[PDB]
Amino acid sequence: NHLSIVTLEEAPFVIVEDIDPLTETCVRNTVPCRKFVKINNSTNEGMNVKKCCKGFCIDILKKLSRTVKFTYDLYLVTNGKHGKKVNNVWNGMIGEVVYQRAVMAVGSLTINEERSEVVDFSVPFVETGISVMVSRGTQVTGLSDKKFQRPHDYSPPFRFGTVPNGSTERNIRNNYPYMHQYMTRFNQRGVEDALVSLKTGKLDAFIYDAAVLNYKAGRDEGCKLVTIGSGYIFATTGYGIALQKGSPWKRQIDLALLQFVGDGEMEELETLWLTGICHA
Ligand SMILES: CCCc1cnn(O)c1[C@@H](N)C(=O)O
């Protein structure tokens, strides 16, 4: 009854480190996690590489394993990231669950309606949504600011973007086509790229998952970043653990999460991994 569980690196929720080759054992607050890695860029031939995983979501998984009394084989997703339907097929962590390669998915995984059609989710345990990060000093009200609505009213035309394939991009693409097609010229490879662009005056605003942006603003070195809610209340949600549609384990996973919330364990984890120092 070893459970196959998929995850994905995104600090501080999931952080991946190398194993000690002397022992090949994960130690401290880490747990073993493997990744299938290709031999070359020609075919899908590959081998699994042992790594170690830690972070807020890993600590949640550890608590769940302890409380619900299961063991698991944790692996990192190799095709896609969080989850997107591409060419009519779900990839990422969502895909691993949909096609029953994983019983659960644990990480910075946003609950939404489209995903809920094909997987079940636990109760949310981290609040999230769409937020906007800017350099401290920049003034925006949220995504309805004229700077976002009419970017060519500004010099240079207002520069804002997100990271492709996340639920944030999907929420914009599905509802505001002009905004989406304007934004794509400012696509960011990841959060770290975007933060550098903001701090060096090469980008005006970065639109992304709120939980991660709140975290990054909270401990930016120099406290040079500000996050504000998009105001897209329709997108307010949370991270959840994804399970198979109709999973018999949602009941017990939820009970455990609710136990942790009630007894202060969740509060302790938030203090340990998420709380910031930068005043807003
Ligand atoms: C690398 C993109 C991550 C992202 C952007 N928005 N949202 O919601 C996510 C991620 N939390 C997700 O579940 O798709």
Residue of 90, 108, 111, 114 to mutate, ligand 1, most atoms within 8 A of C-beta: 108
140, 228 Cβ separation under 8 angstroms: yes
Question: What are all long-range contacts of 38-46, with beta carbons under 8 Å and residues at least 24 apart?
Answer: none
Tokens 């002009």 sit on residue: 178
Closest CA to 187 of 158, 209, 160: 160
Tell me if 208 sits within 8 A of 61, measured CB to CB.
Answer: no
Give the number of the atom of ligand 1 that is nearest the alpha carbon of residue 212: 11
User: Which H, E and C letters describe 86-103, residue by residue?
Assistant: ECCEECHHHHHHHCCCCC
What is the SS3 assignment for 235? helix
Resolution limit, Å: 1.5
Under a CB-based contact definition with an 8 Å cutoff, are residues 112 and 167 in contact? yes
Choose among 131, 128, 126: nearest CA to 236: 128
Cα of 206 from ligand 1 centre, angstroms = 13
Q: E strands along the chain, which residues?
A: 3-7, 15-18, 31-38, 46-54, 72-76, 85-86, 89-90, 104-105, 119-121, 126-128, 130-135, 160-161, 205-209, 225-229, 237-239, 242-244
Which secondary structure element, helix H or strand E, spans residue 146, and what is its range? helix 146-149
Residues 31, 107: Cα–Cα separation, whole Å = 14
Query: Rounded distance, CA 112 to CA 74, Å?
Result: 24
How was this structure determined? It was done by: X-ray
CA 91 – CA 83 distance, rounded (Å): 5
Q: What residue ranges define each of the domains in the chain, with the CATH number in brackets? A: 1-128+236-274 (3.40.190.10), 129-235 (3.40.190.10)
CA-to-CA dists, residue 67 to 54, 254, 255, 257, angstroms: 18, 11, 10, 10
Tell me if 137 sits within 8 A of 51, measured CB to CB: no
Over the Cα atoms of the chain, what is R_g? 19
Query: Please, which residues have CB within 8 angstroms of residue 50's CB and are 6 or more apart in sequence?
Result: 19, 24, 32, 34
Residue 5 in contact with residue 72, Cβ under 8 Å?
A: yes
Chain centroid to Cα 278, Å, comes to 22
Residues contacting residue 69 through CB under 8 Å, at least 6 positions apart: none
**Pocket lining for ligand 1, CB < 6 angstroms:** 81-82, 108-110, 163, 166-168, 208-209
Q: Which residues pair with 121 in a beta bridge?
A: 242
Cis-peptide, bond into residue 12, ω within 30° of zero: yes
